[PDB]
Ligand binder design. Structure first.
Ligand SMILES: Cc1ccc(C(=O)NC2CC2)cc1-c1ccc2c(-c3ccccc3C)nncc2c1
Length: 343
């Protein structure tokens, strides 16, 4: 049966949600869209409801909406945000103009944690572990995050973590680059899933040291900052950059050796430093994977091959179809009423 909705103004718009969701309350962030913390009396969980902004204003948004929804309904892992529900006040396609999403709530993100807790070695392991485990899931479904960062890691009171914003296209017109992998920033050859490991590395290094590893100002400064630690590229990596300008420009810079991670991260679990040198490598191909990373002896106290699941193949076949603004809209509708809540 169709539930009974109610109305109220939150974040300057009409919010019409089913009565199971009570005590809606804005998060204060805004960086994640329009989102409220709520209590779901159906599951009895604390949830996070997000009202999609004019989801179908144009092909770009239309397809973007269906894309996110597809991703959310497909992902079912304890370290990745997933769909507890999705609903619309509309009774028929005709109406349909808004999409509402629901997920578990955490209330905070990594970014807003270095400024608080002092972070012991132990908690760092737990946090990096969850990112790698969730990453392994995501990667198995052939989905790349591409822009992983501390602000995309939703963490709750008990340092439990969920990865957010995965697989969402690119940017329009900017974007922080303090964690993006160099392969991406200078746009080189085909780039594998390992781009995310580069990011995990930056984060891990940040959690260990309390300061941002590569807080560059603009594009060349970032590259300056990274090459000063991992060193400039040899002929092996240069030859693989099946690019042009980027290759000729990269090699223009002054050659530099890789620093000694051991003395860069003064005082830090040695096993931690070992992992960083395996993640922060210029060459993605020679960079460690999430699965490999979960076996490293640093995560000794948490590793458990049986409890580190994989995803089913993600049917990404819609990413090539050219559709009308109304068709992308309709598919998002189909995806909404065919939805089935998890157990
Ligand atoms: C609702 C929603 C829908 C979809 C996706 C998403 O990543 N979609 C991409 C396609 C994958 C993300 C969210 C999202 C945003 C902020 C959340 C906060 C939260 C609350 C306050 C301050 C900071 C945070 C992080 N706490 N718990 C869960 C949260 C979930």
């Amino acid at each position: 049966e169709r539930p009974t909705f109610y109305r109220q103004e939150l974040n300057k718009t009409i919010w019409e949600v089913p009565e199971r969701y009570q005590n809606l309350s804005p998060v204060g962030s805004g960086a994640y869209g329009s989102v409220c913390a709520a209590f779901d009396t159906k599951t009895g969980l604390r949830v996070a409801v997000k009202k999609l902004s004019r989801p179908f204003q144009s092909i770009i948004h239309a397809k973007r909406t269906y894309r996110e929804l597809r991703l959310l309904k497909h992902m079912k892992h304890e370290n990745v945000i997933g769909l507890l529900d999705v609903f619309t006040p509309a009774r028929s396609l005709e109406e349909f103009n808004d999409v509402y999403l629901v997920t578990h709530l955490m209330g905070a993100d990594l970014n807003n944690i270095v400024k608080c807790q002092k972070l012991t070695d132990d908690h760092v392991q737990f946090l990096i572990y969850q990112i790698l485990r969730g990453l392994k899931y995501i990667h198995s479904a052939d989905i790349i995050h591409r822009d992983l960062k501390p602000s995309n890691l939703a963490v709750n009171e008990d340092c439990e973590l969920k990865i957010l914003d995965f697989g969402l296209a690119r940017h329009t017109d900017v974007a922080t680059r303090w964690y993006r992998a160099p392969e991406i920033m200078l746009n080189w050859m085909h780039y594998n899933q390992t781009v995310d490991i580069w990011s995990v590395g930056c984060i891990m290094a940040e959690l260990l040291t309390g300061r941002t590893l590569f807080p560059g100002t603009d594009h060349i400064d970032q590259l300056k900052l990274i090459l000063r630690l991992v060193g400039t590229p040899g002929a092996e990596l240069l030859k693989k950059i099946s690019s042009e300008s980027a290759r000729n420009y990269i090699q223009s810079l002054t050659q530099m050796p890789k620093m000694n991670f051991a003395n860069v991260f003064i005082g830090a679990n040695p096993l931690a430093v070992d992992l960083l040198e395996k993640m922060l490598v210029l060459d993605s191909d020679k960079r460690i994977t999430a699965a490999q990373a979960l076996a490293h002896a640093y995560f000794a106290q948490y590793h458990d091959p049986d409890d580190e699941p994989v995803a089913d193949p993600y049917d990404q076949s819609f990413e090539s179809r050219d559709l009308l603004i109304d068709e992308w809209k309709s598919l998002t509708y189909d995806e909404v009423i065919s939805f089935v809540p998890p157990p």
